[PDB]
Amino acid sequence: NDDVLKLTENPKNWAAPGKDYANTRHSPLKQINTQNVKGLHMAWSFSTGVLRGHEGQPLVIGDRMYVVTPYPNIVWALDISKGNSYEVLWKYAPRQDDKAVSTACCDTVNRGASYADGKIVFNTLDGYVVCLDANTGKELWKTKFADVNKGETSTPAPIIVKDKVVTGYGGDEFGARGRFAAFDLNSGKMVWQAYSNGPDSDVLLGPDFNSKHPEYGQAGQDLGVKTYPDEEWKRGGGCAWGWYSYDPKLDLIYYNTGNPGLWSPSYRTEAKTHEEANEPWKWDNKWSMTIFARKPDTGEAVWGYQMTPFDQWDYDGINEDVLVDITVDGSKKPCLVHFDRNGFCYVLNRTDGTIIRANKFVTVNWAEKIDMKTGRPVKVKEHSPFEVGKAVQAYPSAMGGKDQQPVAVDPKEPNVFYAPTNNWGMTLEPMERAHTNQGSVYVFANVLMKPEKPGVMGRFKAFDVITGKARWDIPERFPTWSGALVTDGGLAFYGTLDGWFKAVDRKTGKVLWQQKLGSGIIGNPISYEVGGKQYISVLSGIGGWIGLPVTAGLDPADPYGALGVSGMAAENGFYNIPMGGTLYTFCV
Amino acid sequence: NDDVLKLTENPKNWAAPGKDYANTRHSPLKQINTQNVKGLHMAWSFSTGVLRGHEGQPLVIGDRMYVVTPYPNIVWALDISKGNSYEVLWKYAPRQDDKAVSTACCDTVNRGASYADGKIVFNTLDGYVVCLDANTGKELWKTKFADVNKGETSTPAPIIVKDKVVTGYGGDEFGARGRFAAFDLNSGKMVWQAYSNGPDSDVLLGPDFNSKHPEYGQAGQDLGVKTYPDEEWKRGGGCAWGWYSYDPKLDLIYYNTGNPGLWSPSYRTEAKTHEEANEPWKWDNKWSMTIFARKPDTGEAVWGYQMTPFDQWDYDGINEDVLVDITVDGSKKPCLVHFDRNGFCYVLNRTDGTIIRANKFVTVNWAEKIDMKTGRPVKVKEHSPFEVGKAVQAYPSAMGGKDQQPVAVDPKEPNVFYAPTNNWGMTLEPMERAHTNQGSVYVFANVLMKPEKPGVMGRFKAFDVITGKARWDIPERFPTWSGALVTDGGLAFYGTLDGWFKAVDRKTGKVLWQQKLGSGIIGNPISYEVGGKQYISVLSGIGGWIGLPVTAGLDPADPYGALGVSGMAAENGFYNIPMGGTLYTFCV
Ligand SMILES: O=C(O)c1cc(C(=O)O)c2c(n1)C(=O)C(=O)c1cc(C(=O)O)[nH]c1-2
Ligand SMILES: [Nd+3]
Ligand SMILES: [Nd+3]
């Protein structure tokens, strides 16, 4: 979209969820810098009137700001032309089906909206893709996309590519079937949809899909139905509830798929042993856990790389695909950096999916490494949950080395990424499958999480995606479940789950400014400019999967609660973090 | 209470709801003043995890803060020893009966807690007087006082007298019978209770009640039975849901009663005309609308003055009674200043209730003045709603010249009060009484409100309670529903319903600092000191009666909703103020 390109190119705006199509989350503004960040102070705050995890970020287009709250997903439009104050312009309150609340696995969170040609597009938890007039907030059109009865809920933030609104949804834990569709920007009608599994026609494979990497899986083999048992692909997960990227020059949309569904691996293979089930090409559970590159016009996939075939830990691969150009191995190549849940930082050639680098960015014991030739992980049997009635320990836990919280990078130094990380393990015990009803809880496994190192759960690092070494490592008592933000002022912004919003030096990582906000910070900090002055805004309010024991009011005495999070939350004082929702803005 | 006197005498604390027994709401901390307030910035914020109106204020004792949220009335204990940061000590979540929400007339608010001898006392909306251990938050004792089935809800903040916990409740609009009782600070029973009407034995009228002012009403006449029709006193209102004060030297507790029940005056008298109904001593509806001075040990009343006999406007007299010594009429007299809802600022001799001054602090057209000789208002017929089916305009509206938002005064200059004010009128149309069921809405009147002057709703004034003239008047386009705070740094603090927190100069009223918070401010600002640094804290989140159309989600197309607030709220952009709940702390 030409308008999105113009807006995102202007450093004064935050026109895209991740600041641009490449999801760099980098701001060239330098008014706020290392020299004066000590004087950072709140300018104004805005309550959302809603309580639960406040994920995502606001959108800033010139003098206007748009905020999307969690369920019921209220859209607030604010006038910020004065910079040091705000004025509510209008409010859009969609009437939703509350069944989506109980059909949501990890919270009633929303990851933001997108803007283009005077229109605002967002996803409601009940699966509606809505387009509103940016000026008056009048509903231009809404299209029912996700079905709650099939276990699908639309948590992510869609993006706009030339004239289409592309997005997915979640629901692998409810037996849903992943889908990624495009809707006309002006009409809202569906143009095409690509399933994460099923026959080749259902996946919309390109004519030259993985032509350069036949070892990744090609068309004409119907891996979407064969790498699954009889018809488990119908409940085979693969939901795309993560972040979406776009390469204008190459005309490629990048997105990833979730887990293959239920957490009992024996039910995703006909083999009886871990060794036989992991036989290559037999039960890969494709195309779940795959990084896709599709053409926006038709949706045909140019290439696709599955990171975790035959999943056994719920290592959803949806994490954002940051696009940058890095000089590595003697030349400048168009790279795609992706911090996957499985604990591996993948560096791929965004032109054909070629594996450039794959290093562990957290403790990883389920796999030895990623085989460069076959592109498959060298799994460790004693750290792969397979049998029913046996608990197996694994690093990282189901939450992985990094969940949906996005990373940030400065393109001028594309090899150094600022990334929040999870540092806890788990013991997952598969259970017997009690039903095959789509739209109902479809996990069948008991989980227990202990933080790897007591007193240390989250870690904000300056990780070099080429050498696999971190410049600095900041350990935090609470998890680092907020997005990152890097600025040309020499600062890196992130927030902790107990409410601390911090600013650190990009070079050393020492904290230069910090303030404890109202609640846990699971939003993504943004940087924009109004009236010639720079502002930093971030959402607060505990929630998400990490905050489910609090937002859902679960019992702290049941450690298995929340898929293995209640016990860890109860042990690390999460229940003492009050709920909330509020946008904090700072200036110098 | 001895402990309370010392904690309140120490300027570093805010140990009482109104900073002290006299409710002066004045802080001597000059560490923050008129020359550096421009640099006042937020130090930290704490979300309550609860929505709707956040009235009241926190309690700072040493370096421990206690905050009482609105329903379910969660009590948060914060460790503020670090000063610029906070840590939760404990949390108390009471199990309540949800009908208290539907039985609450004007939002699910709470006005704070009191502290003494390591104990925290507060009121739950469902009518429970709770005492918690300050250190651990454990429940020391719980006593059921207010009955929801009888239309009673406990919104006010109790205070701790020597060894008694005294409090009242609300529910005049539900046909409740007002009561004011005391409870043992250690065990928790009711030591005594005094009704606002009924036989003299129920009102606890001492042998020397109104000795120096027989024209007020004396014991032995059973006015609480005569001034009402046959048995309407059973639903005679008089609830004491306002602020309570205490004079240790005189050993007297000060509290006032509310309206006498329904808003259809023809049902609170057996006369057929306004003149006959207003005959003195016939239908006074005593002891509603009465300022009471009682002995804490027995509860017997030393004196009582009814400001509005035979109420016809719902001019609840519960407003705070600030106790100060003022040099007037040739000498320094122990006074009681009270900005009543009827629009008159009463200055009475706190020893016997003698009327010293009665000045109009806002536009008042229902009464010409207050006669000293009779102590009764000179009513204006054309502005006194009486008959059924006749809309009658009145200044001020039912919300009065000033609702529960407390005023502030510096005893150094006891004649000048910093008081928020309401500046809108109404057209009240009495209606036929459809029922006599206690516990159900008991009003029977169609109300419509409109600001007296366009573009002006609230006004923060510097009012001389002796001369009746205002030093300065600050007009606000939104209501000034927040309490006031005055400091020895030459500053006065208050907030607006749209979220603006302001710091004005005491001498001129000029705004020296202002910031828009997350939501409407209906909380009371406080000043305290920790680690040698002065801090300013206030609660935010729209609510209360003024904000009920937003918190209750009332139809904006129903002007009569919220007892007339909906129409005015819909016209002055109240619906664009998001809900919230968050405590903000500032420092220089
Ligand atoms: O597999 C799915 O269908 C699905 C959805 C979501 C979601 O929609 O929020 C999460 C997950 N899976 C998941 O595995 C996960 O760890 C997770 C964390 C969060 C969050 O917002 O904090 N959502 C989700
Ligand atoms: Nd998942
Ligand atoms: Nd009332």
PDB file of C-alpha atoms in Angstrom, chain A residues 366-518:
ATOM      1  CA  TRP A 366      14.972 -30.476  23.555  1.00  0.00           C
ATOM      2  CA  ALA A 367      17.178 -30.170  20.452  1.00  0.00           C
ATOM      3  CA  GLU A 368      20.934 -30.381  20.004  1.00  0.00           C
ATOM      4  CA  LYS A 369      21.025 -28.010  17.014  1.00  0.00           C
ATOM      5  CA  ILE A 370      19.392 -27.471  13.627  1.00  0.00           C
ATOM      6  CA  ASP A 371      20.807 -29.683  10.887  1.00  0.00           C
ATOM      7  CA  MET A 372      22.061 -27.339   8.161  1.00  0.00           C
ATOM      8  CA  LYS A 373      21.607 -29.918   5.381  1.00  0.00           C
ATOM      9  CA  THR A 374      18.107 -31.247   6.141  1.00  0.00           C
ATOM     10  CA  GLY A 375      16.914 -28.162   8.015  1.00  0.00           C
ATOM     11  CA  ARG A 376      15.488 -30.388  10.760  1.00  0.00           C
ATOM     12  CA  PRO A 377      16.241 -30.238  14.498  1.00  0.00           C
ATOM     13  CA  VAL A 378      18.297 -32.961  16.168  1.00  0.00           C
ATOM     14  CA  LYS A 379      15.803 -33.765  18.924  1.00  0.00           C
ATOM     15  CA  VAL A 380      16.761 -35.103  22.360  1.00  0.00           C
ATOM     16  CA  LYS A 381      14.618 -38.052  23.463  1.00  0.00           C
ATOM     17  CA  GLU A 382      14.845 -37.422  27.210  1.00  0.00           C
ATOM     18  CA  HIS A 383      13.482 -33.886  26.621  1.00  0.00           C
ATOM     19  CA  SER A 384      10.639 -34.692  24.205  1.00  0.00           C
ATOM     20  CA  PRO A 385       7.225 -35.493  25.764  1.00  0.00           C
ATOM     21  CA  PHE A 386       5.795 -38.476  23.907  1.00  0.00           C
ATOM     22  CA  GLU A 387       4.250 -41.211  26.069  1.00  0.00           C
ATOM     23  CA  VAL A 388       0.998 -40.823  28.003  1.00  0.00           C
ATOM     24  CA  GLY A 389       1.409 -40.888  31.774  1.00  0.00           C
ATOM     25  CA  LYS A 390       5.066 -39.768  31.707  1.00  0.00           C
ATOM     26  CA  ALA A 391       6.163 -36.217  32.516  1.00  0.00           C
ATOM     27  CA  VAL A 392       9.117 -34.963  30.457  1.00  0.00           C
ATOM     28  CA  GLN A 393      11.204 -31.885  31.258  1.00  0.00           C
ATOM     29  CA  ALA A 394      12.077 -29.424  28.498  1.00  0.00           C
ATOM     30  CA  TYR A 395      13.870 -26.095  28.025  1.00  0.00           C
ATOM     31  CA  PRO A 396      12.217 -23.835  27.040  1.00  0.00           C
ATOM     32  CA  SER A 397       8.730 -24.436  28.394  1.00  0.00           C
ATOM     33  CA  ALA A 398       5.635 -24.276  26.191  1.00  0.00           C
ATOM     34  CA  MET A 399       5.939 -20.485  26.440  1.00  0.00           C
ATOM     35  CA  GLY A 400       9.310 -20.888  24.715  1.00  0.00           C
ATOM     36  CA  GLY A 401      12.312 -18.604  24.594  1.00  0.00           C
ATOM     37  CA  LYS A 402      10.015 -15.813  23.425  1.00  0.00           C
ATOM     38  CA  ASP A 403       6.239 -15.605  23.100  1.00  0.00           C
ATOM     39  CA  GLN A 404       4.269 -13.082  21.018  1.00  0.00           C
ATOM     40  CA  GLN A 405       6.127 -10.124  22.639  1.00  0.00           C
ATOM     41  CA  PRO A 406       8.067  -8.683  19.662  1.00  0.00           C
ATOM     42  CA  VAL A 407      11.701  -7.725  19.332  1.00  0.00           C
ATOM     43  CA  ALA A 408      13.240  -4.533  17.939  1.00  0.00           C
ATOM     44  CA  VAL A 409      16.218  -3.834  15.677  1.00  0.00           C
ATOM     45  CA  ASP A 410      18.014  -0.847  14.186  1.00  0.00           C
ATOM     46  CA  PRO A 411      18.495  -1.410  10.418  1.00  0.00           C
ATOM     47  CA  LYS A 412      21.783   0.535  10.503  1.00  0.00           C
ATOM     48  CA  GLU A 413      23.079  -2.368  12.660  1.00  0.00           C
ATOM     49  CA  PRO A 414      20.823  -5.243  11.526  1.00  0.00           C
ATOM     50  CA  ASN A 415      22.796  -7.982  13.306  1.00  0.00           C
ATOM     51  CA  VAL A 416      22.073  -6.631  16.820  1.00  0.00           C
ATOM     52  CA  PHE A 417      18.534  -7.368  18.007  1.00  0.00           C
ATOM     53  CA  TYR A 418      16.950  -6.181  21.255  1.00  0.00           C
ATOM     54  CA  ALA A 419      14.801  -9.052  22.426  1.00  0.00           C
ATOM     55  CA  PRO A 420      12.754  -9.950  25.507  1.00  0.00           C
ATOM     56  CA  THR A 421      13.130 -13.560  26.556  1.00  0.00           C
ATOM     57  CA  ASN A 422      11.495 -16.178  28.764  1.00  0.00           C
ATOM     58  CA  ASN A 423      13.804 -18.243  30.963  1.00  0.00           C
ATOM     59  CA  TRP A 424      11.715 -21.004  32.535  1.00  0.00           C
ATOM     60  CA  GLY A 425      11.289 -24.721  31.936  1.00  0.00           C
ATOM     61  CA  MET A 426       8.475 -27.220  32.192  1.00  0.00           C
ATOM     62  CA  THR A 427       7.556 -30.861  32.757  1.00  0.00           C
ATOM     63  CA  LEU A 428       4.768 -31.793  30.336  1.00  0.00           C
ATOM     64  CA  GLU A 429       2.838 -35.041  30.830  1.00  0.00           C
ATOM     65  CA  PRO A 430       0.714 -36.178  27.851  1.00  0.00           C
ATOM     66  CA  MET A 431      -2.788 -37.443  28.589  1.00  0.00           C
ATOM     67  CA  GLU A 432      -5.378 -39.603  26.870  1.00  0.00           C
ATOM     68  CA  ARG A 433      -7.608 -37.945  24.284  1.00  0.00           C
ATOM     69  CA  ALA A 434     -11.141 -37.685  25.659  1.00  0.00           C
ATOM     70  CA  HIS A 435     -12.888 -36.277  22.569  1.00  0.00           C
ATOM     71  CA  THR A 436     -12.515 -34.993  19.007  1.00  0.00           C
ATOM     72  CA  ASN A 437     -15.041 -32.136  19.220  1.00  0.00           C
ATOM     73  CA  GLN A 438     -13.747 -29.059  17.424  1.00  0.00           C
ATOM     74  CA  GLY A 439     -14.306 -25.882  19.420  1.00  0.00           C
ATOM     75  CA  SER A 440     -13.702 -27.462  22.851  1.00  0.00           C
ATOM     76  CA  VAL A 441     -10.526 -27.647  24.950  1.00  0.00           C
ATOM     77  CA  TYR A 442      -8.210 -29.904  22.908  1.00  0.00           C
ATOM     78  CA  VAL A 443      -4.900 -30.028  24.830  1.00  0.00           C
ATOM     79  CA  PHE A 444      -4.827 -33.284  26.862  1.00  0.00           C
ATOM     80  CA  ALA A 445      -1.654 -32.669  28.858  1.00  0.00           C
ATOM     81  CA  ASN A 446      -0.738 -31.471  32.354  1.00  0.00           C
ATOM     82  CA  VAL A 447       2.050 -28.905  32.592  1.00  0.00           C
ATOM     83  CA  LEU A 448       4.167 -27.557  35.470  1.00  0.00           C
ATOM     84  CA  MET A 449       6.623 -24.635  34.984  1.00  0.00           C
ATOM     85  CA  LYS A 450       9.481 -23.737  37.366  1.00  0.00           C
ATOM     86  CA  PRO A 451      11.687 -20.744  36.322  1.00  0.00           C
ATOM     87  CA  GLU A 452      15.058 -22.014  35.155  1.00  0.00           C
ATOM     88  CA  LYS A 453      16.909 -19.860  37.690  1.00  0.00           C
ATOM     89  CA  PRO A 454      15.071 -18.854  40.883  1.00  0.00           C
ATOM     90  CA  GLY A 455      14.543 -15.118  41.034  1.00  0.00           C
ATOM     91  CA  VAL A 456      15.139 -14.753  37.281  1.00  0.00           C
ATOM     92  CA  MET A 457      12.300 -15.200  34.793  1.00  0.00           C
ATOM     93  CA  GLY A 458      12.565 -12.565  32.070  1.00  0.00           C
ATOM     94  CA  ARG A 459      15.705 -11.350  30.319  1.00  0.00           C
ATOM     95  CA  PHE A 460      16.147  -8.418  27.946  1.00  0.00           C
ATOM     96  CA  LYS A 461      19.150  -9.017  25.695  1.00  0.00           C
ATOM     97  CA  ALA A 462      21.089  -7.409  22.850  1.00  0.00           C
ATOM     98  CA  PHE A 463      21.473 -10.615  20.841  1.00  0.00           C
ATOM     99  CA  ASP A 464      23.704 -10.804  17.759  1.00  0.00           C
ATOM    100  CA  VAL A 465      21.682 -12.986  15.369  1.00  0.00           C
ATOM    101  CA  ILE A 466      24.756 -13.820  13.266  1.00  0.00           C
ATOM    102  CA  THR A 467      27.276 -14.946  15.889  1.00  0.00           C
ATOM    103  CA  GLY A 468      24.683 -16.108  18.420  1.00  0.00           C
ATOM    104  CA  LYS A 469      26.335 -14.080  21.201  1.00  0.00           C
ATOM    105  CA  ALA A 470      24.574 -11.456  23.305  1.00  0.00           C
ATOM    106  CA  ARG A 471      26.117  -8.033  23.862  1.00  0.00           C
ATOM    107  CA  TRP A 472      24.452  -7.723  27.273  1.00  0.00           C
ATOM    108  CA  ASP A 473      21.923  -9.659  29.340  1.00  0.00           C
ATOM    109  CA  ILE A 474      19.527  -8.030  31.810  1.00  0.00           C
ATOM    110  CA  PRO A 475      17.821 -10.516  34.174  1.00  0.00           C
ATOM    111  CA  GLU A 476      14.476  -9.547  35.664  1.00  0.00           C
ATOM    112  CA  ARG A 477      12.610 -10.946  38.663  1.00  0.00           C
ATOM    113  CA  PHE A 478       9.396 -10.955  36.640  1.00  0.00           C
ATOM    114  CA  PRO A 479       8.904 -11.964  32.995  1.00  0.00           C
ATOM    115  CA  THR A 480       9.646  -9.557  30.159  1.00  0.00           C
ATOM    116  CA  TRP A 481       6.317  -9.922  28.342  1.00  0.00           C
ATOM    117  CA  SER A 482       6.369  -6.525  26.627  1.00  0.00           C
ATOM    118  CA  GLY A 483       7.518  -5.622  23.162  1.00  0.00           C
ATOM    119  CA  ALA A 484      10.804  -3.869  22.505  1.00  0.00           C
ATOM    120  CA  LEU A 485      11.533  -0.462  21.008  1.00  0.00           C
ATOM    121  CA  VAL A 486      14.905   0.858  19.829  1.00  0.00           C
ATOM    122  CA  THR A 487      15.573   4.514  19.042  1.00  0.00           C
ATOM    123  CA  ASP A 488      18.364   6.447  17.348  1.00  0.00           C
ATOM    124  CA  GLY A 489      18.817   8.270  20.665  1.00  0.00           C
ATOM    125  CA  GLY A 490      20.841   5.280  21.869  1.00  0.00           C
ATOM    126  CA  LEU A 491      18.021   3.757  23.935  1.00  0.00           C
ATOM    127  CA  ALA A 492      16.137   0.467  24.199  1.00  0.00           C
ATOM    128  CA  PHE A 493      12.675   0.425  25.797  1.00  0.00           C
ATOM    129  CA  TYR A 494      10.919  -2.551  27.422  1.00  0.00           C
ATOM    130  CA  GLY A 495       8.611  -3.310  30.330  1.00  0.00           C
ATOM    131  CA  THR A 496       8.335  -5.928  33.065  1.00  0.00           C
ATOM    132  CA  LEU A 497       5.293  -7.888  34.217  1.00  0.00           C
ATOM    133  CA  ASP A 498       5.281  -6.207  37.638  1.00  0.00           C
ATOM    134  CA  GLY A 499       4.874  -2.767  36.015  1.00  0.00           C
ATOM    135  CA  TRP A 500       8.408  -1.419  35.549  1.00  0.00           C
ATOM    136  CA  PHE A 501       8.860   0.530  32.306  1.00  0.00           C
ATOM    137  CA  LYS A 502      12.587   0.910  31.667  1.00  0.00           C
ATOM    138  CA  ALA A 503      14.974   2.691  29.303  1.00  0.00           C
ATOM    139  CA  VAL A 504      18.463   1.236  28.816  1.00  0.00           C
ATOM    140  CA  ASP A 505      21.567   2.100  26.820  1.00  0.00           C
ATOM    141  CA  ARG A 506      21.791   0.199  23.535  1.00  0.00           C
ATOM    142  CA  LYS A 507      25.567  -0.209  23.830  1.00  0.00           C
ATOM    143  CA  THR A 508      25.910  -1.361  27.454  1.00  0.00           C
ATOM    144  CA  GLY A 509      22.410  -2.234  28.632  1.00  0.00           C
ATOM    145  CA  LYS A 510      22.551  -0.224  31.859  1.00  0.00           C
ATOM    146  CA  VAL A 511      19.245   1.247  33.006  1.00  0.00           C
ATOM    147  CA  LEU A 512      19.105   5.021  32.535  1.00  0.00           C
ATOM    148  CA  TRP A 513      15.445   5.592  33.527  1.00  0.00           C
ATOM    149  CA  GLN A 514      12.669   3.494  35.063  1.00  0.00           C
ATOM    150  CA  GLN A 515       9.231   4.058  36.616  1.00  0.00           C
ATOM    151  CA  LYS A 516       6.752   1.550  38.054  1.00  0.00           C
ATOM    152  CA  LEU A 517       3.422   1.924  36.251  1.00  0.00           C
ATOM    153  CA  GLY A 518      -0.081   0.930  37.345  1.00  0.00           C
TER     154      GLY A 518
END
